[PDB]
Design a protein around this ligand. Structure first.
Ligand SMILES: [Mg+2]
Ligand SMILES: [Mg+2]
Lengths: 56, 456, 456
RNA sequence: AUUCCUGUUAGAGCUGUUAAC
DNA sequence: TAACAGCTCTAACAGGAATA
């Protein structure tokens, strides 16, 4: 289904429409994504066991 | 009580190639993707010249000619990949030298071969190559050939022929890749061809490979020494090396003397503070002037109390100094059990005590072997059955075995002069040793710092 | 109805110099005090290198000697100041290269130039740099000379040799000061000593001068584009430059292609959000995470609705955004009356409409006249008899024409590459345009960001 | 390309306003 | 999507030097 037909399809009937936003949209809101959270966790843990400066 | 601290196996470091296509195995990555400097087109075409006695001239042509043809390995086939020639593998043409560039060793050298005078032979060879001083732009790498008949002056007490030749030629700024009968004396052609091809490409100015995802803000210093057997006492020649990565894409590798007389290999406060300040200025010059956040120092012997303070007083507070001593001779050795059919994994480091760890720089590596895919490869299986673990003694690092262990493991893979998978020591240590030999042979080098491409 | 809103002349911005002294005349202050960055030792000494054909190297050494010795201004003596000698004025020795720090271009470059192939000529010039690359630590700045015989490849359609060379040597970290026969001829031959000398100091170290009265909490952004004429259509390559004064003393000036193909110079909402994100992330990295409080986005063309929405949504509410558009060609032009002999004082801004203002980046400047002190000076007197103002069409702001106008005026004076007193456009726009030309010539540069000293 | 921007010759890019398709 | 109007920009050249 081409995007334009979907837009017409929605515009045609947007009164009755549930939305199901996943974690992808929050990606732009500036919130760290799943991968960003994973990398923050590794970095947070890696610096503590191996004593390294966090902000360096 | 038979329980030790949990060992951690550092993964095999990756090497950077053309188009930043990473690979652990250097030669295979060179075949598949090509040299690191190919994207910059830095060497362009490679132009090389000869300097040998005419009675062996043809030999040089032959090997150079055979540099331009494919070769299939017969020895160490479990590791070495099929050679494709300089034009194909390095994406760079190999230029046949013209008669103007080609030189002949002056006749009196042969005569002094009978005299057994190493200094005279080296000076005569330099004067033979003096015909190439003016035509420095025409050629990039010189191929000096020393015949087996000169073996009497090859090595003797207090003198090293290759060392003296390179010490004489380095201030003139023209690389040589000395070729002896050995290179044309072995059996596996692909091994020597990989060696000479990589050596020539790196000596021209290109970078065959670089450490993948290497931090540009860390400088890895390495200090080594050499013995000169003086008539009255002993002489210790200490020289340093740096393998930092500048803000650009290429990476640097420069050694220099630590200097008037030393009877012990331990740098005092003044000398160590001076060599580290020179290293700091060297690093600043490349990175526009930015401080190195952390500096790693690999010494073959332990750091003195004054020497540690000398290392500290040379840098600011932001710099993190991890003084490390590398020990090659240890009573420990490891056996891998699951009894593994192959030796203990390379990079497996075992923290023995506070500020003392065992690193297995030597060992089996996964996925590198070509024949029988999916099996470990032991590079030194010829020399011995086991891999001997080196030992790190920490002196200054605040914390973390991973930083030093991974840094050293990755550093043992960027020796272009080496045509095998890795080394026993980081390139800092081996190049500091090589330059220590060079300086010990020739005292009139202490003033200037030199790149790795000259002495490799 | 002929009485417009009262204007106010923003005074000449002060420039931070040696020992934090301020002087609105750049060259006079440099002679009197010295470079701002000379307070610390970022450049230890300006070591140079030469790359030219063997025939024209004498021009390079002659011009270097001319830089060494003082010179007197012959043309435009109204503004220029007598050269005091590089060592005296920049307080740093200028080191002439030795034999090995002085390379020779391949003779194949002449053949390529005769063939009229710009790409291969640039590649050959870059490949000639290997002799210096073996000694990259030795020198700081490389003076590449191009003989007039290569004019056929200097500039033609779909190509520019200067941009290609800059983009090829930018990832190799070596600054390059290209010299055309223009430093040979060039009668006011103390011009050369200041333009070339200030460029050499900036490329070896940095910050010849810094703008004073600069809030550390403002990051200034300038977007500019260029056109690559495709066979079928066109490609609009737009890139963004950023200036800011960080917590450290080193004022920062970077650029980075925001970008695949674009058909119009108006960035899409996703592209602006990504470019703006990269910008404030760079600021945060240079400000230990502190959020910028004022953001100025100067664009040569009007912001669409998408661009303004992207600006609004990329930042938080605490950081007010000053979206301003700069119009170069305008119908309006003014004449000062008390009628004055010299045109209107530089920096006068005249609010025409609630969103559109005239800014006189060109005009008479007070207090920088060498002869007959007190007389006004018009920088573009030779080019134009009257100053053509620019139009600032504010697309987003809370209040205050003075806040943006003074920032633009101060940003028009920190172009170290500019020999003259000021620039018609802020340094953000000019550097974004220069980098846009570079990226248009070499599309494979979008990965990295670069400091000003590489491309100025 | 030490610089500066003054003009010339062209084309695009946006807006529009119509006619459509 | 095809013209047409304006506003503004860059892309190639050429080009002379700070109130005389
Ligand atoms: Mg070798
Ligand atoms: Mg320049």
């Amino acid at each position: 289904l081409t995007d334009n037909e979907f837009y017409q399809h929605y515009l045609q009937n947007s009164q009755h429409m549930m939305w199901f936003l996943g974690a992808g949209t929050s990606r732009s809101a500036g919130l760290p994504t799943a991968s960003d959270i994973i990398w923050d966790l590794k970095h947070r843990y890696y610096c503590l066991h191996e004593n390294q400066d966090y902000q360096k | 009580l038979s329980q030790l601290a949990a060992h951690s196996t550092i993964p095999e470091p990756l090497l950077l190639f053309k188009d930043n296509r990473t690979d652990t195995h250097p030669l295979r990555g060179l075949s598949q993707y090509g040299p690191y400097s190919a994207c910059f087109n830095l060497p362009g075409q490679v132009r090389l010249a000869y300097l040998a006695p005419t009675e062996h001239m043809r030999k040089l042509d032959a090997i150079v000619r055979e540099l331009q043809n494919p070769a299939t390995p017969k020895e160490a086939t479990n590791y070495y990949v099929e050679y494709g020639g300089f034009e194909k593998v390095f994406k760079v043409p190999l230029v046949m030298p013209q008669e103007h560039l080609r030189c002949l060793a002056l006749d009196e050298c042969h005569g002094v071969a009978a005299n057994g005078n190493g200094l005279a032979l080296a000076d005569k060879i330099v004067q033979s190559m003096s015909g190439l001083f003016r035509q420095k732009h025409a050629f990039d790498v010189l191929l000096v050939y020393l015949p087996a008949s000169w073996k009497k002056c090859f090595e003797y007490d207090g003198f090293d022929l290759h060392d003296r030749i390179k010490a004489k030629v380095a201030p003139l700024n023209l690389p040589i890749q000395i070729i002896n009968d050995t290179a044309l004396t072995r059996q596996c052609r692909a091994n020597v061809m990989w060696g000479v091809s990589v050596a020539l490409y790196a000596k021209a100015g290109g970078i065959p490979w670089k450490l993948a995802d290497w931090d540009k803000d860390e400088a890895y210093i390495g200090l080594s020494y050499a013995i000169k057997k003086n008539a009255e006492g002993q002489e210790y020649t200490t020289c340093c090396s740096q393998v930092f990565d500048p803000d650009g894409t290429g990476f640097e590798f420069v050694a220099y003397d630590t200097r008037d007389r030393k009877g012990n290999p331990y740098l005092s406060y003044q000398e160590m503070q001076s060599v580290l300040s020179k290293s700091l200025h060297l690093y600043q010059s490349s990175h526009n002037g930015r401080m190195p956040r952390k500096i790693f120092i690999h010494k073959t012997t332990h750091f003195t109390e004054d020497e540690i303070q000398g290392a500290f007083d040379s840098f600011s507070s932001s710099t993190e100094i991890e003084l490390v001593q590398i020990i090659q001779s240890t009573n420990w050795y490891g056996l891998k059990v699951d009894p593994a059919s192959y030796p203990v994994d390379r990079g497996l480091y075992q923290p023995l005590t506070e500020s003392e760890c065992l690193l297995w720089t030597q060992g089996s590596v996964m996925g590198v072997n070509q024949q029988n895919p999916g099996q470990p490869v032991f590079k030194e299986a010829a020399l011995t059955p086991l891999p001997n673990p080196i030992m790190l003694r920490r002196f200054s690092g605040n914390g973390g075995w991973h930083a030093t262990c991974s840094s050293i493991l990755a550093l043992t893979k960027v020796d272009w002069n080496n045509n095998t998978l890795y080394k026993k020591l980081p390139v800092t240590l081996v190049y500091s040793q090589v330059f220590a030999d060079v300086v010990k042979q020739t005292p009139e080098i202490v003033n200037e710092i030199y790149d790795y491409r000259f002495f490799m």
